[PDB]
């Protein structure tokens, strides 16, 4: 996914005291935890150059004139409600592009992202980002106590 090597380590070390010994599925996960809610995913989309003219982006700009032909003759015109009756005649389809099979289009670019739900991020104020205590080690440090700072 997009999540980095720096920042996946601090989330697993704060929540489950992992890191420095290999990551596994932890024992007891809570409802607002990280690893049961983190769900990565990936898709692939074609290049959309001059050969491939991106019929969807031409449809969002002007849906009144359809560029997009899929299962026509078996549903309504794609400028009115899809709840209506069948309209046209059967004919070939031109969209989407085949990304797999013998007619698969070359020049494919991958895209990765993730979705996290019910999870505040966390950066613990600890030395090695573990949980060695509720009153942490830098919290009872003589550098951060007995002094006054101002963070940004």
């Amino acid at each position: 996914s997009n999540l980095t090597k720096d920042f996946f380590m601090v989330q697993m070390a704060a929540s489950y005291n992992q890191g420095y010994q290999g990551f596994n599925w932890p024992n007891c996960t809570k409802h607002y935890g990280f690893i049961n809610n983190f769900e990565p995913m990936s898709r692939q989309v074609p290049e959309y150059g001059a050969n491939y003219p991106n019929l969807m982006a031409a449809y969002l700009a002007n849906p009144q004139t359809m560029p997009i032909w899929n299962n026509c003759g078996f549903q309504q015109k794609t400028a009115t409600n899809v709840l209506l009756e069948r309209c046209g005649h059967p004919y070939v389809a031109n969209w989407p592009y085949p990304l797999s099979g013998r007619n698969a289009v070359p020049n494919q670019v991958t895209e990765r992202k993730f979705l996290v739900d019910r999870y505040l991020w966390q950066i613990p104020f600890s030395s090695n980002f573990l949980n060695m205590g509720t009153l942490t080690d830098l919290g009872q440090n003589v550098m951060y106590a007995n002094s006054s700072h101002s963070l940004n």
Binding site: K5, M9, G19, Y20, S127, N128
Partner: protein, 50 residues
């Protein structure tokens, strides 16, 4: 494959605690032991068709 990288994780132990922990594990009687969890010897024997 286009590139490949090994990642490790160095635990930031204090250099006084590590130096007392290193000298215990250099010792012969503090010898690290491991064991394969399967504990088996794989042997395949041919069966003819039918």
């Amino acid at each position: 494959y286009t590139q490949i990288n090994l990642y490790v994780s160095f635990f930031p132990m204090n250099y006084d605690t590590q130096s007392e922990l290193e000298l215990m594990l250099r010792n012969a009687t503090n010898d690290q032991n491991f064991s394969d969890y399967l504990g088996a010897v794989n042997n395949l024997y041919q069966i003819p068709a039918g």
